[PDB]
Structures are given as structure tokens and as C-alpha cells.
Amino acid sequence: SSRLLPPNRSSLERSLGDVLPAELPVPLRELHDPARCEAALLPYLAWTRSVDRWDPDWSDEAKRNAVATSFVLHQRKGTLTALRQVVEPIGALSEVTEWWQRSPTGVPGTFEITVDVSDRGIDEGTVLELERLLDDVRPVSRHLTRLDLRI
């Protein structure tokens, strides 16, 4: 700037010290914070965090928490806690099934789960995604294709 130049300086040099540097922003630390990425380059960060399912229809508050908690979801796939948070944009946590609620030794299929999801914000559609959105959390052969839903 003007101060950077020596004290004996013209008004021409004093103006050029504000112009000839011409500083620029460096938005480089914001590329790896998902809560501070811009919306135009957000699916670049979603690839390297291995975000398995993604929709270009969510709000920005619903897009950044799906990337920030992508570590915790894949860290403990089997545990119920990750299942609670994989349904993040659909605000829904009602009930989870277990063995002893059914008395005759489980269903044939060794108790595949029929989870409960409740959505009041959106009523149109939202059914045909939930059988494949929960597919990545589901193991390959520990669970079967039986499913239950609720609107």
C-alpha cells in the first residue's frame, strides 16, 4: 500500500502502491471445510468423502451436513447410531425393531429389518428412493429385501 512505500514519495507513487500489488483472495482453506464450501463446487468434496448417495434438490443446510457427517456414517455401518443419521434430510426418528417383539423365533430370513420413517414436510413422492437409499447401509446378506414404510 501507500505505507509500504518510503516516506519521500509522490502522490503518483502513492496511488500506484495501492494498484500495482493488486491483492487477491485465496479461497483454498474453504475447499475442505464442508460448512464453508461454495455451492458450485460442493460435489467435488462429496466425491473424496465417498458420499454414496446425493441429491441436487436439498437445501444448502441439508447438503453440508450430509458431507460433514459422512465420516461417522461409514465408521460404524452396523450400529444403529449411523442408521439414525443416514436419514438426515427427512427428519424422522420414531421406532426401531428388535428380535423379541416377535415371539415365533423371528421371520424366515433371520429377522430382516422393517424400519419406520415418518415424513410430514413432503408428501409427494419420497417412497421410491427409500428402498435404495438404505441399500448402502444394509449389508450384502445380513438383511433381506423386505421393507416397511410410512407417510
Next chain:
Amino acid sequence: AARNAPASAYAAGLFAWTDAEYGFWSSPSNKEIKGVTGTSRPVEFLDGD
């Protein structure tokens, strides 16, 4: 943090340093104050104006 000093004891540190380094006949009016790190309401003296 930075606190505001009355800038009168720092001048006494210059009248007592310039007499032991340059003599009492030498004014302290261009000598450094080592402890300071600021000046409330900073003054302007650019080059030769």
C-alpha cells in the same frame, strides 16, 4: 493485551538514558523507546512536509 500508558515515564527513560550515553547536552528528541508497541491517536509526520 495492549494497555494504554500515559507516555510520561517513557520520556523519563529517555532523559535518563541520553545523559548516560550521549550527555545531558544531547536532546532525547530522536531516540528510541524500546518498550512501546502502539500509540493511541497516532500522529502524522510523513517525510518533510
Next chain:
Amino acid sequence: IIDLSQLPEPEVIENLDFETIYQELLGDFREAMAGEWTAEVESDPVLKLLQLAAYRELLLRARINDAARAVMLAYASGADLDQIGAGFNVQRLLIRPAQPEAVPPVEAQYESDKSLRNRIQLAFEQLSVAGPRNAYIAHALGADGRVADASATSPAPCEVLISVLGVEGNGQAPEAVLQAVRLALNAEDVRPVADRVTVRSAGIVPYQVKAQLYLFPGPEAELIRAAAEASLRDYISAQRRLGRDIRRSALFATLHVEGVQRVELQEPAADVVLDETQAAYCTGYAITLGG
């Protein structure tokens, strides 16, 4: 597993050309010199200083963009994934390293690009030891003499059907190479779950392609015909890398090179389907010119 480093470049800072950077500096300069601007002030030495300054942040908007490429896994080059893979527990290993059989012919070799990045992509798919769909995949890529894996389950539960495919040549993988996946999956699976290991789980049908391309009257037809297989012979080996389908359009677009005005296809009458279970193999091709 899809390579992201084959897309158009993202711009993190905007990349203006040389002219609109120059007039943007002049406008700021006029505001600073307001009340003092004269025709004499915009002299030839002053203007040539401003033509430098319009060029220096032309090399700084190019500096921020070229730095932001090599930080993201999209368009990162060699000797720089070691800083990124350390953040994803990815260390490069030795595939026949520098053993000097004879001392002047040194033969040093590491893992190449575009497959070590894939392991970094699968780094988060190796955390869960409770066996999701990709942990059986992402641990089976530890070997070298194979290709990637796909998981499915038709029968009764806790019976995993994994299809261990392998690219080394004509189809059938050896059974001694098949035993290495149980050495790579011993304390990574779940203990009650039990997999069956089928190398070819649906069958192999022989495929070909016959294309009669046209080139322009012009440059040489030897290097332009051969450039079609430069994007094709590595493309056929990447089809069962994801276990997915080939199309008629895959037999068109992988033959369009510089000097093509129309192409043609005769080998399928209708397109075939290849699911995540169903796969096939291509024996031998013959792509010539019609001219």
C-alpha cells in the same frame, strides 16, 4: 469407482483475461488520483508499468487455480498424493522394486497414477469391519493380478455371492489366485457371515466389433486409425472394472478421433444387457477403414 480427474477444470478463483484486468486496475487508479489526473500523467513508462501489473495477477489467478488442482484428488499429479494419501491412510507399496540383477540397468518402479487414487477413494470404505457392500470390494483390491469385485445375494441370508473377476488375459482366472481373497478377508469380514467365491458367476460369451470408419482426404491413415484403439484397448479392460454394461454408443464414441466425419456399426443387431452379476469377454477386434 469413477475417475473424477477426466472432467473440465474447476475454477476456484475466476480467470479473467488480460484486458478486463487492465481496465479494472485503471478504474481504481483514477479514484486514487482523483483531482490529480492529467493527460501527461498517463505517460508511456507509467502505462508499461500498468501493462505489467495486469499481467502479474494474470499469473496469480493462474497460480491459485493451478495450486487448487493439485490439492483436490481431481487433477492431482505424482509425488503429491503422498501428502493426500497420508490423510487417508494410503501408503504406496512396492510392485517388483529396485533389485539390481545387474548394477548399471537400474529397474525402479512404483505404483502408477489413476489406480492409487482409486484406493484413496476406497479409503473410507475400509473403515467399517462389519462388512458393508464396498468393504468386500475395497479389501479385495489389495492384490495385483486381478480386477475389482462386485457383491450380490440371491440365496438365503448370510450367504454372500461375490464375483471375483480378474483381468490378466483370456477370461478364466486361476484357482490359486482365487485363494488369495481368503488371505485378504480373514479378520475383515464378519464371523457369522459366510461367503461363496465364484470367479465366473454368470458365464462368458464371445464378443467382437466390426467398424468401417471414414477418414478425410488429407493426413496419414496409419496413425489416425491406430489412435482409435489407444482409447479403446484400455476401455474394454475398464468395463468389468465396474461390472457394468457395454453399449452400442460405446462402440461409436471410442472410435471418434481427429479426422472422422461418420462411423458405422454392424456387429450387434440389438444391444445386450450386462447387469452387476452378468459379465462377458471380448476376444478379438478388427477395425479398418472403408476408404
Next chain:
Amino acid sequence: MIIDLSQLPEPEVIENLDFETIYQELLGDFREAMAGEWTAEVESDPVLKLLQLAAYRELLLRARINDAARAVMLAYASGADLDQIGAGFNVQRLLIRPAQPEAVPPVEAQYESDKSLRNRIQLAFEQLSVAGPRNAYIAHALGADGRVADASATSPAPCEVLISVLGVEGNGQAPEAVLQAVRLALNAEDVRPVADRVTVRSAGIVPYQVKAQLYLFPGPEAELIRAAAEASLRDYISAQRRLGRDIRRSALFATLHVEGVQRVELQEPAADVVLDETQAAYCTGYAITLGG
């Protein structure tokens, strides 16, 4: 098995900088651009006032890019820049002494050095997460304290996994108080549709006495070498608190016949123990005696 960060090669984006190789370019970009109309390379010429801002302020922008590229790499970030890498992987910096003082001088809150955060981000991958294999059911069964190691099995494939907790307090039975203390951890740390029948024991106290009629030479060393073989028996039994638990007859012959015994007459081990994962073992004591 983590790789140390001190053995990595230097990367591409980090550049050693020079003021001269920027400033001598700005000479060689302006001198050709004037076509010989400017030729005063004396420092007092006011073009060299301005080319030393365009070589210093550009060098500050080159250093911001190098500081920001190091701040997103695990082997180079420090300060509040490992906070953003740590918050993404759910890793926080510890608290040695708390923040608030009770006295008039403010006690500073000590924090672990930034050379140890690169340990904790790198150990955030290879970490106990879920009881998948045989080696992870037991490590998630380490909530209590009065207990030695354990092993798991599964007699059917599709539904049931069996975990047989043994705790060495007395005879090696599991108390009923710690039966529910295991089940609190397991529900949230295991695969959801497991039939984890966590019962205290398939079989507990299986009393394995031992007796050995030691035959020695009556010389001077017979007091020192007899107690050395008994010490080799103690750490063996302490190594048999296990589910591998291979109590034998001929394996105890080798231990006894190390250096100097002539022979031994074993009474209580007469046959080999049949081995399954489900049962356990225990040794109540022995009756050692001299041959004469």
C-alpha cells in the same frame, strides 16, 4: 500399522521462494517492454521503487498460497488449521487442566502439543469401531476390569453368535452383576440383527488337578532346579487361562524335562483333553512330592 510422516518425500506444491528470482524477472519483463526507452537501472530511479513492491507483494501472495496449502495437509498443518481437519473426523483436542481458575492469577489451560495431533488424526482410522470379526467381539467386551482375554465362535451361520465371557476372580465363573454390564456396551457397538445370547458360560469350572512324582539326583542342585521347574509350571497355568486351553499329557513332559529331571510320574493327567471353544478350564492346585 500406520506410516510415520517423517519418511514421506517432499511434495509438488510447496516451493522454496526467492525474492531475487521474482525481482530479476520483473527487470527482464520491463526492460524488453520499453524497447530501450528506459535504461537507468540505478536504484534511485523510481521504477525500481515500484518493481520492489510488485516483487514483494506478489511474494506475499505466493506465501499465502503455500501457507494455505500446508494448512490442508496432515503432515504440515498446525495451530487452528488442524482444528478443521480434526472437526471433520470427530477428533477433539484433549483437556489436561481445565480452563477456569479459582484464584486471582488466571491459571492457563494446558493443551497437548500440535506434534501429537498428527498422531490422533492418523489413529482415527485404525480404531475399534464395530465388533465384526473374531478379534473385535472381544475388544468390545473390555468394559469391566477383573477379567482376562476371551475368544468368540459362531455355531450357526445365519443368526446366532456366541460370546463366552470368563473372568478370573475366584474359580473363573462369571458373576451375575457383570452379565448386564456386558450387554450395555454390546447393543450399540454390534451389528443390529444379532442373536447375541450372552449367557455366563457354556461350561465353567472344569477342575484340572495336576500331580507330578519328580525323580531327581540327590546332589546339591536338587533344591534350586526343582523350584525352577515349579516356576515354569506357574506361568504356564497363567497362560492357560484361555479358550485355546490345550491341557495335555505329553506337552507337560517337555516342560518338566527341560534340563535335569530323569523322569516323572503324572497321576491326574491320564488322557488328552477334548477341545471345543465352548468349555473353559481352571487349575485349583497341585500336590508336588519328591521321589526319594
Next chain:
Amino acid sequence: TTCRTADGDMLDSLCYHVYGHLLGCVEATLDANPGLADEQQPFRAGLLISFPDMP
């Protein structure tokens, strides 16, 4: 050898009194200082610069 600046001190002036020369001594100071370049060139009253040894 960490030193504390004042609110008008500048980088090339400081490490000339410390080192005695400025060839390869300023950008090495910006290298071995996290976030120093991000901070504005007229330094704040209480920033800490750790000057490295053997310039």
C-alpha cells in the same frame, strides 16, 4: 527464538536486525510460520514470529 512484534513493525526490517542480511531470510521466515502471510503486512501489536536458526 520467538519474538513479539509491534503494531507497525514489518518483516524485512525485523529480520535484518536479527540476521544481518536478507538473502533467503524473509521467505524462510514466512515458510516456518503458520498463517503469518495471511496476516496483513503491517503486523498487529502482539503477533508472535518464531525466527528460525541457520538462515
